[model samples]
Target chain A: VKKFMYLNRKAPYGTIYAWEALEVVLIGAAFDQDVCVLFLDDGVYQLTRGQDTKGIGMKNFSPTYRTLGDYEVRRIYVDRDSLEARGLTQDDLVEIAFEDMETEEEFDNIVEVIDSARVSELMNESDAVFSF
Target chain B: SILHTVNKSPFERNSLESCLKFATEGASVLLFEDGIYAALAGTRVESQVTEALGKLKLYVLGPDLKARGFSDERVIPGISVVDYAGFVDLTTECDTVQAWL
Candidate 1:
């Protein structure tokens, strides 16, 4: 078994990197490997809410992120500083959760907030890393 | 061997150069999207394309080339054209796929 990480550091639309990286992520998950995804820098914008490409004639694929959980992929880490630097908060992004946790008659979602230090740790542990 | 996919034109971006620089010997490179432009004959990047062809198996997306109005006959010598399905087959043949974005 290998730990695979897809490192996305580019924004969507301007170029095809982000969309292509997402394709790789979907395919990688199908192989049943331990998969982790890291969104940093401009890549953080990929999850921003209300992305409309209609005027640009491109299909808005942001909703595809919601299907990651269905693929059995749950490890998604977002850079805290990257979000703030872009003037975005978790509220400004799409909701992503692997599963709903039941506790005391209430349910909560899990979202991983990671810093650069932790990202380094993850990269070190990864057996294979794909970056775009 | 690695399957390196470059999707940008050499004139518009440095991805093609970077992909060639980091590509291992005998790797297969597939140019798609705007990347098909680099494989056209008589272009400014023909020399680098020729040089990379010496080391790597090269392919361009046939549909993309047709969409861009580049005839298959004019594609640089030694380069083959693949469709979407062929792209998947290429992916399976390589252990790793590096998308030079």
Candidate 2:
């Protein structure tokens, strides 16, 4: 099996990154690969709750994330620094398993966590790799 | 070994150039989805393969090519069809991944 790590740095409503990321993550899960998603910088907004893109007729897909467990795309990492930087508390974000890099130690640890993520390991081990 | 997946057609001015760059750098390339057509023989790839990407590793995804009925007998040189497991294995060992979809 392959391991995929996806780094997201964008909001959900503005562009296609969030949607495309979701699609690829689902594909990874469908293939029975280990998939890890990392939310960094502005990307945490994609998981924020109480989103209402409906007024503009955009589909609110945050609910779709709940189905991730069914697909087994279970590793979701939220940047503590990103949440705080966006003035967001955990309650302000989606109800998912995530950690924030609030403290200096946590930040350092998360840096190491992402650096050692299996995605990079797979990059060096897999016969192929793709980034979006 | 690097597996580079490109998401654009050959003639289009998309990340195909970047894909070629990665291939030139020794990354194995797979043209899939819309990218499969980029490996169509007798196109600009014939010349580009000689001028720019002469020694690059090029591949086409079989499913995508069969879907488009592009798997003709006259296959392009240096271009072969690999399956998903091949793609999965390649990505498993890449040092970095850059998707240009």
Candidate 3:
């Protein structure tokens, strides 16, 4: 099976870009291909621990990440230095597990902390790249 | 007048009413997604928007309204329906815009 990659470049709130990509794969369930979500810039700032949108007065979209199992999306990629460049550490990132729908199987902390070289290596591994 | 955009359902929470409480007179409110329900006719939340209509310019996204399967028929009088371009126009017309969940 081929791999599909989604690059998340926008900060979660500035625009609808971040949510759009997540929602797309979250809704795209009938595929046999593998999916990869790569975060960059302020994109990595998403999925950080202890996010609060109540004060922001907008719908909390981050909660949907925990819900990846509701659809076909499995695993997410983090740019090796994406958070490192932002003064954040992997410890600050939240946990994610894409489950098996029929078996109801939960994965073992599926967020992959990837290397910079493999970002290109992995992108080439996929048929095409998608961003929003 | 400021543009206050509310995306919550009125029946689900008090956001719209509280939005009304703090929103000064002549302020415009744009309802999107679930907030569109508040603008529907013949509902308990109808009066909330109906009364606010006298003081506020209320608008709803036609797509969100249409996505939910209702039409201009159910939308209350005085609350205008706008498409994406009109949404941008509302933002530009107001000096500032804020979001209400």
The most accurate candidate by lDDT is 1
Question: CAPRI band of model 1?
Answer: incorrect
Tell me the whole-model lDDT of each prediction, alpha carbons only: 0.81, 0.62, 0.73
Worst 10 residues of 1 chain B by lDDT: B17-26
Alpha-carbon error at B50 in model 3, in Å?
51
lDDT per residue as tens, model 2, B27-64: 66767888877777777666664344456566677888
Per-residue accuracy of model 2 over A68-125 as CA lDDT, tens digit each: 6556555666666557756876667655432332332211111222322443343445
Q: Tens-digit lDDT track for model 3 on B1-101?
A: 79999886665568899888888888899988657667777666677679898788999877666544346776899999997789999999999999997
Question: Model 2 chain A, poorest ten-residue lDDT window?
Answer: A104-113
Q: Which candidate comes out best when scored by DockQ? A: 2
Runs with alpha carbons beyond 4 Å of true place in candidate 2: A97-130, B1-94, B98-101
Query: Any runs in candidate 3 off by more than 4 Å, and if so which?
Result: A99-106, B1-101
Error of 2 at B73 (Å): 49
RMSD of 2: 9.1
lDDT of 3: 0.73
Model 3 lDDT per residue over A3-101, tens place: 788888655553677677787777655675787778875577556655554433567677777666555666587885765554456776777866776
